[PDB]
Amino acid sequence: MQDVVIVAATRTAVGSFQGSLAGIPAPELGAAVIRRLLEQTGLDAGQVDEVILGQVLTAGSGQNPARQAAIKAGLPVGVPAMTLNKVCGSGLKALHLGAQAIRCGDAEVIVAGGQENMSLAPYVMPGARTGLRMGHAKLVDSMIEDGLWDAFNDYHMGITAENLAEKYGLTREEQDAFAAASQQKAIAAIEGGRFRDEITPIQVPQRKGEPLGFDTDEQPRAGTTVEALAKLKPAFRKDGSVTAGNASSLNDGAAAVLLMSAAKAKALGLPVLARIASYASAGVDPAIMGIGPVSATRRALDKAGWSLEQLDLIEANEAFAAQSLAVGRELGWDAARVNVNGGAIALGHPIGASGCRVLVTLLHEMIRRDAKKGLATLCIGGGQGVALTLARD
Amino acid sequence: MQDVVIVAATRTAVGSFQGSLAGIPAPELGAAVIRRLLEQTGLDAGQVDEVILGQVLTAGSGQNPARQAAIKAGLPVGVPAMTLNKVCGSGLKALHLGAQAIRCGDAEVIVAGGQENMSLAPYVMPGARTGLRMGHAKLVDSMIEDGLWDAFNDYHMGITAENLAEKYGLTREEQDAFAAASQQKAIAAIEGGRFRDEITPIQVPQRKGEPLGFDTDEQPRAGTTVEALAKLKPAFRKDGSVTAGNASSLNDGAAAVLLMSAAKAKALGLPVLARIASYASAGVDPAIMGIGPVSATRRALDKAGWSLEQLDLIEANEAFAAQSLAVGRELGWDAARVNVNGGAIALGHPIGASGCRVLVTLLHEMIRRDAKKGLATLCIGGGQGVALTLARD
Amino acid sequence: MQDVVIVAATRTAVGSFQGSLAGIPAPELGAAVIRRLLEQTGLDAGQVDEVILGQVLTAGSGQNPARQAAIKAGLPVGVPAMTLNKVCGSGLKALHLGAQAIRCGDAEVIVAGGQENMSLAPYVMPGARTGLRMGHAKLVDSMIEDGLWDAFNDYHMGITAENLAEKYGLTREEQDAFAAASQQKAIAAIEGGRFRDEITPIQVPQRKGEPLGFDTDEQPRAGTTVEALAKLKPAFRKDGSVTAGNASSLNDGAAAVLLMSAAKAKALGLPVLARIASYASAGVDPAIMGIGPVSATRRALDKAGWSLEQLDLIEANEAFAAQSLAVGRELGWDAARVNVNGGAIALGHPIGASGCRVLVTLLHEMIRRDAKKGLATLCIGGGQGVALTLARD
Amino acid sequence: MQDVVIVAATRTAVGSFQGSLAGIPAPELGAAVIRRLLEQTGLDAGQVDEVILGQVLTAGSGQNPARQAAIKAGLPVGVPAMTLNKVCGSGLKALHLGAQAIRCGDAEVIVAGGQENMSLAPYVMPGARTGLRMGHAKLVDSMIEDGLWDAFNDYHMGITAENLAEKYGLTREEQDAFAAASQQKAIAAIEGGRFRDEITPIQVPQRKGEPLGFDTDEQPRAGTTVEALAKLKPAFRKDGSVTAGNASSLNDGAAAVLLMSAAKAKALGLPVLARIASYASAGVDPAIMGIGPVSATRRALDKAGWSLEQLDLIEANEAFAAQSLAVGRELGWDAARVNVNGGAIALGHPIGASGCRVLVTLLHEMIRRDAKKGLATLCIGGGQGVALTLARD
């Protein structure tokens, strides 16, 4: 069996909804991060064994979005590719599948991550194929239906967040305070240059002129305070506490890593950024999907033989302030080690990419701080979680 | 690393386009086959570690089709699930992923396979979200765009078949002969009860009355003859050889297997139906995607330590007669051992399920013949192939 | 000023929803009745001064449906045409506009009537032009929105019928009895050949074979009784009395007359079928639009100098049994003189044509019985009415 | 038979496509002009006998757009209303219908004109009702299909303009000169306050703030020059002369007049702005529909007993410079008396309102010039024309 290492890790800056990446299909964002990984390592494209990319919103995307990213990146036709959907966890579960293929010797080199363009997710017209017959019909927002709506309880992810606010007695004010601190940390990280190493610029075609470079996360909102956030109306339930300001946003982006066997990295003479110590999935009740990270984290820590207090750094994707605070209540983690450069409330949640986006952020901040142990974890719509651990010597 | 064994294998009958399963969402087809695997083995649903399902056409399907099948089958919320898309190969690649998880010790019990309802694939309206502005616009058939259209060359899978007919000099007459034999063999197998053991009936809700059981493959065309096939118009190109009669059809169905470690099967007292001896993916030129099975097959045989001559029985998915003939010409296999109960020209190509559909059909025929060594292989839109080997003592 | 006469009058048989005329656009139904009027009179097409046709549902119908009917009928490009919309009254109001043009000497010969294909009325997608942005959207049934829904009260025409059932204390049983008698009278008229003279057959193109003649009204339902009708659920309101069986149906058809000055008819040597004695419109509260015929009838009788009891025959379009019984309560007419060959509950309500359809039925039954005075009247969605009187010597 | 007089005349400013009126449904534009006519004359709303409004694009507009304008303007439910469609001529034909009703003694007071919101014309999905079956389908721009496309020849109104440019040998340079002059004249009229007396302001709801008044025509393009027009690409045919700069635009607006018998105006003490001396329609070849004004004008002059040389002032709607030049060549009129404040190339062509828009502009200019004899004329898609004459003492 082989040990699995990361030799390159990169992401796009994260675009806002109908923002800077709104014209660029998800597989072109994937292609741009694949090219960068090969540039950073000087790796011949022929050395890649597989491309594994998460993407949730694939209506009208064409055959196999992961194959589109691989071909558009200039990888030869001989490199196989697959797309996966574990909703919000897709981009991290891609690394789990790549690690598995490398551990059992099916591959030595894998590109793994995710890509999502929520801006470009289309409307869908069920029933037009066979006949609507009569009566007004529903033109379905595929982003909501396929990305943000619970298939079992017939309500938004935001109601799952209301459920956790109730269960843990989390107040509006606690949720707003968490949201403001995420904003403050993201703006400080951006201004402090903490995202420069991890970001691949996208050359965005303009209406007129040469392309403009997009290289700076654009979701964070200056001047976010508990006082401004207190004015917002509840977004999902009349007397609710979850708002657009303490929830993650809608976003565009891609993120990927170059996985290898430790043996292959050494044979190529590539420096190792981190080893993968463990990975895990878990399932929970869809009604409280935001708690998925608790069991996923405990399983990953158990598989690595670690205790939570040994983690130097944690990236716990911020689907909703209520969801994040609920995970922190259950795990009893030190919040000062969690999302130290800000989280998805400030930076965005480009669903199928977020799992790899938070992993890339974790890895670069671990290198900066000389951290030895880190965890990436995400909740998943439909009631699941993923977690993955990274180690450095 | 553990042997990976199959302890149960089942599929729906395959429905024709707007046929018997046209009202049943893909995940309900998946739920029905997962329920049957547990019934056949008497396994408690809590013993399942993961559900891995292929499904290509997911526009408006809701969050995580695989998770929807797992929950609807009565698996507990604790069982994680993921959907994958390797287009035509999705349903077989799912067993490769399940094999990897078991070989790494990440799981002991995996449900793997695929599900597709082409009848229900909707229309998509790109640009409606941001504004069509003016001018007539294209309402996109997601079944064609996401399932049947090459993303690189902007033409139908059927043109890839024409490309193979031209390259191998495969005549209209040889393609129609292959298609007639597929029909004759499938009809003989159905009438002979050859598919009874492998089929899970679906109770189809009726507008009026108690549900009707669907348990008989409905795509095969009785009294097909070469003389009748000779009269059809080319389906994809003016002077082409590929027709509706020598191409696969549009279909609905699901298929799944219950994978275990050899150790777990022994501890439960479950008989081993077959061992997975190897599996592989390959990439080829998208323009001739139908040839993907050649290198996928050669890699899977190399990984098993087997020669082609050692295979007793082969299931090679029939995307098009031209594609199936080309693969047979390159590999030089004995056609008498290939698709002995008919293939997809007769039985249908429910894209994301086909990979597991042909594996289920391979396994049941291997048992009746006392075959020791079997191969399942598929071409994949976008220029890929998958192959997997079965061994019996 | 000129006196206005009818020298020819004809209609299609009325098609059921997705019935025999479901493939034939409204202007082709109009063209077929225009051709017949000219055949019946031997009139040179160049003698027509104008074509005035009602059509309500014109979404995607192309420029000026009335001009399409005129050109398709073979009338020269020199004949002007206009389309009008007075909803349910369009096909009778067309005769009012033609009568006005003839009375004041603007024209000597006019084709007037209406045409509707409700089967072909399309779905409409508001907001797609400028952007739906996010959220599920409404795909609008144009037939409901433009034809059957009140623009002021935001409810169906059927609620206006519930309002009249309340106001006049009309029971479910009274409404069902009216519906059954309409069915019985329509079937007796069809079987007795009372519609043969007034109907122009349509040659309906088939999937395979030569066209099939459609010449027999297909909406009437044999075996309609108060006992069968008693089983139906209320169609518009939970504890309501209006059902699909005591309401008019959805239908396809066209109907037109050839109007002339009495002077022009005499100069051409054409026999006069009837003179137009008077015409009128009225407005009422949209909430009780079904009562529109009361004031419209009184104004038309006043303009002709007639009393209601002088009418030998009345065609009062049956939007809903409640609506019809309410009009009869207000006017105190002899019900034995109303809709003697059945009404719209049995024969259908092809909205934009119905006004001329009931006029053509009135005229032919007046000739059969040697009636001297007749009235055609219709209620109109949005709260209006039309009425027109016919005389014979 | 009574003289028909105009006692009030007003129009909205004309909005550009997705400009100031882009959020205001056509019938609300109509309501605003009807309210203004009553305010200007101090007429009680109960004195109106009918509302006759043109509107071409009615897909999803709801029952009877004219009735919606009448009710929203505060006319009592007793006032009947009808919508008409004579495409580009609808807004003028409405006054012809109103004139006829008054000449026959059917009415004493009619509101007549037209209304259009092209910005709000929706997309249509033919075939969704009965089933698209498979294959990419056409989402129809109803503005193009129902407003701008010839139903007989299957090409744009702009090709009818090319047909006239070829037939009359009208150069690109002569078309651009005509277009530049239309722009220069409209801008001079706006800046001079020439349209203040004829315009009813619309209070436009704003996302945030009190409504903003829209009272200034926004289609005209300041600093238009022949040198700038010379650079534009042909809009309809590869080597054509018709461009976006020498064609009318897409627009939103409404216009209406208050018509009375001479007797009724006298009895109310209302001054007569003008008398309608005559009106006419004509039909021509759809391929050269732009020439419709020639025979319509000749018929209207014949009916008034006037020669072309007696006209002081002409409004000839500018569908295209090529179309306007062709009409001028055939009639031989003095261009200095035509569209003296600019026309539709500059001011816009809100299809169903244009007929009344140009009549309102004619009447206000006739008053300032003390013109005695005026003509308004329009070409009509489908091969028609309308013309109407105004007299002042």
Closest CB from B128, B134, B144 relative to D136: B144
| D→B interface, C-beta within 8 Å | 17, 123, 125, 128, 132, 134-141, 143-145, 250
Write the DSSP string, B152-175: TT-SBHHHHHHHHHHHHT--HHHH
Measured distance CA(A130)–CA(B19) in Å, rounded: 12
In a domain, D349, yes or no: yes
Place of tokens 């149906």: C249
| C→B interface, C-beta within 8 Å | 125, 127-134, 137
- For chains A and C, CB pairs below 8 A equal 48
Paired sense of beta strands D50-54 and C50-54, if any: unpaired
Paired sense of beta strands A81-85 and A50-54, if any: parallel
In a domain, D376, yes or no: yes
CB contact under 8 A, A124 and B121: no
Measured distance CA(A131)–CA(B122) in Å, rounded: 11
Measured distance CA(B281)–CA(C391) in Å, rounded: 86
Instruction: Note whether B316 and B189 are within 8 A (CB).
Output: no
∠ CA B166-B172-B178 to the nearest 5 degrees?
105
CB contact under 8 A, B138 and D139: yes
In a domain, B307, yes or no: yes
Which residues are bridge partners to C247 per DSSP? C320
Closest CB from A68, A100, A130 relative to B18: A130
Instruction: Note whether A182 and A339 are within 8 A (CB).
Output: yes
Instruction: Note whether A391 and B74 are within 8 A (CB).
Output: no
Measured distance CA(C9)–CA(D169) in Å, rounded: 47
Chain D: closest CA distance from residue C364 (Å):
27
Q: Which amino acid is at D185?
A: K
DSSP classification of residue C286:
G
Instruction: Note whether B110 and B48 are within 8 A (CB).
Output: yes
Helix ranges, C1-89 (H):
26-41, 65-72
E strands, chain D, are 4-12, 15-16, 50-54, 81-85, 109-117, 123-125, 137-141, 199-200, 202-204, 212-214, 251-261, 274-283, 313-316, 373-380, 384-391
CB contact under 8 A, C151 and D60: no
Instruction: Note whether D73 and D34 are within 8 A (CB).
Output: yes
CB contact under 8 A, B83 and A79: no
Paired sense of beta strands B50-54 and B313-316, if any: unpaired
Report the chain C residue with the minimal C-alpha distance to residue A148. Answer: C135
Paired sense of beta strands A15-16 and A251-261, if any: antiparallel
DSSP classification of residue D211:
P
Instruction: Note whether C49 and D161 are within 8 A (CB).
Output: no
- Rounded (10°) CA dihedral A283, A287, A288, A292: 20
Cβ atoms within 10 A of the Cβ of C299, count? 18
Place of tokens 């509950």: C345
Place of tokens 């062509």: D349
Which residues, 6 or more positions from A2, have their beta carbon under 8 angstroms from its beta carbon?
A: A102, A103, A105, A108, A261, A262, A263
Experimental method: X-ray
Report the chain A residue with the minimal C-alpha distance to residue B105. Answer: A100
Instruction: Note whether A138 and C125 are within 8 A (CB).
Output: no
End-to-end CA separation in angstroms for chain C: 21
Measured distance CA(A180)–CA(A169) in Å, rounded: 19
What b-and-e string marks burial along B88-102, b requiring 16 or more CB atoms within 10 Å of the CB?
bbbbbbbbbbbbbbb
Helix ranges, chain B (H):
26-41, 65-72, 90-103, 142, 157-168, 172-191, 226-229, 262-268, 292-304, 321-331, 344-347, 351-369
**Among C112, C389, C118, CA closest to C255:** C112
**Among C194, C167, C220, CA closest to C344:** C220
Rg (CA), chain B: 20
Closest CB from B128, B136, B144 relative to D141: B136
CB contact under 8 A, B125 and A123: yes
CB contact under 8 A, C134 and B129: yes
Which residues are bridge partners to C202 per DSSP? C214
Measured distance CA(B204)–CA(B23) in Å, rounded: 8
In Å, what resolution does this model reach? Answer: 1.8
Rg (CA), chain C: 20
Report the chain D residue with the minimal C-alpha distance to residue B142. Answer: D136
Closest CB from A59, A71, A82 relative to B60: A59
Extract the tokens encoding A262. Answer: 């430790």
Report the chain B residue with the minimal C-alpha distance to residue A67. Answer: B382
Q: Which domain holds residue C351?
A: 4-121+250-387
Burial of C117 (0-12, 13-18, 19+ CB in 10 A): buried
Which residues are bridge partners to C109 per DSSP? C260
How remote is the C-alpha of C68 from its chain's centroid?
A: 20
Extract the tokens encoding C225. Answer: 């009784």
Measured distance CA(C344)–CA(C338) in Å, rounded: 12
Instruction: Note whether C327 and C293 are within 8 A (CB).
Output: yes
Cβ atoms within 10 A of the Cβ of B291, count? 25
CB contact under 8 A, B383 and A151: no
Chain D: closest CA distance from residue C185 (Å):
31
Paired sense of beta strands B81-85 and B50-54, if any: parallel
CB contact under 8 A, C59 and D62: no
**Among C379, C376, C377, CA closest to C319:** C379
Measured distance CA(A58)–CA(A382) in Å, rounded: 18
Residue B125 Rama label (left phi>0; alpha psi -120 to 50; beta):
beta
**Among D239, D89, B83, CA closest to A65:** B83
**Among C246, C60, C64, C238, CA closest to C146:** C60
Q: How long a stretch of residues is chain D?
A: 393
| A→C interface, C-beta within 8 Å | 17, 123, 125, 128, 132, 134-141, 143-145, 250
Q: Cα–Cα distances in Å, from C143 out to C385, D130, D289?
A: 20, 14, 31
In a domain, D360, yes or no: yes
CB contact under 8 A, D131 and A134: no
**Which residues in chain A are closer than 8 Å to C235, comparing Cβ atoms?**
none
Map residue C226 onto helix, strand or coil.
helix
In a domain, B78, yes or no: yes
Cβ atoms within 10 A of the Cβ of C292, count? 33
Neighbours of chain B (3+ CB pairs under 8 A): A, C, D
Instruction: Note whether C274 and C388 are within 8 A (CB).
Output: no
In a domain, A101, yes or no: yes
Paired sense of beta strands B274-283 and B384-391, if any: antiparallel
Question: Which of C123, C124, C125 to substitute to test the interface with B, most B CBs within 10 Å?
Answer: C125
Which residues of B does the annotation mark as catalytic? 88, 349, 379
Helices and strands (H and E) in chain B: how many: 12, 15
Map residue D347 onto helix, strand or coil.
helix
Extract the tokens encoding A127. Answer: 């029933």
In a domain, C365, yes or no: yes
- Rounded (10°) CA dihedral A65, A66, A67, A68: 50
| Active-site choice (D88, D156, D356, D364) | D88
Place of tokens 């507990």: B76
Q: Cα–Cα distances in Å, from C286 out to B284, C94, D30, D68?
A: 68, 22, 19, 11
Burial of B332 (0-12, 13-18, 19+ CB in 10 A): exposed
**Residue C378 belongs to a domain with what CATH number?**
3.40.47.10
Instruction: Note whether C63 and D58 are within 8 A (CB).
Output: no
Angle separating helix axes D351-369 and D90-103, nearest 10 degrees: 70
Instruction: Note whether C141 and A135 are within 8 A (CB).
Output: yes
Map residue A2 onto helix, strand or coil.
coil
CB contact under 8 A, A82 and B93: yes
Phi, psi of A84 (to 5 degrees): -130, 160
Instruction: Note whether D11 and D115 are within 8 A (CB).
Output: no
Measured distance CA(C72)–CA(C194) in Å, rounded: 29
**Among C92, C12, C20, CA closest to C52:** C92
Considering its fold, how many domains does chain A have in total? 1
Answer yes or no: D349 catalytic.
yes
Which residues are bridge partners to A391 per DSSP? A275, A373
In a domain, C312, yes or no: yes
∠ CA A381-A387-A392 to the nearest 5 degrees?
150
Q: Which amino acid is at A296?
A: A
Closest CB from D67, D78, D86 relative to C82: D86
3-state secondary structure B286-329: HHHHHHHHHHHHHHHHHHHCCCHHHCCEEEECCCEHHHHHHHHH
3-state helix, strand, coil in chain C (%, to 5): 40, 25, 40
Which residues, 6 or more positions from B134, have their beta carbon under 8 angstroms from its beta carbon?
A: C129, D17, D141, D143, D144, D250
Closest CB from D129, D134, D137 relative to A132: D129
Phi, psi of B90 (to 5 degrees): -55, -50
Helix ranges, A256-350 (H):
262-268, 292-304, 321-331, 344-347
Residue B119 Rama label (left phi>0; alpha psi -120 to 50; beta):
alpha
Measured distance CA(B69)–CA(C338) in Å, rounded: 60
Report the chain C residue with the minimal C-alpha distance to residue B128. Answer: C128
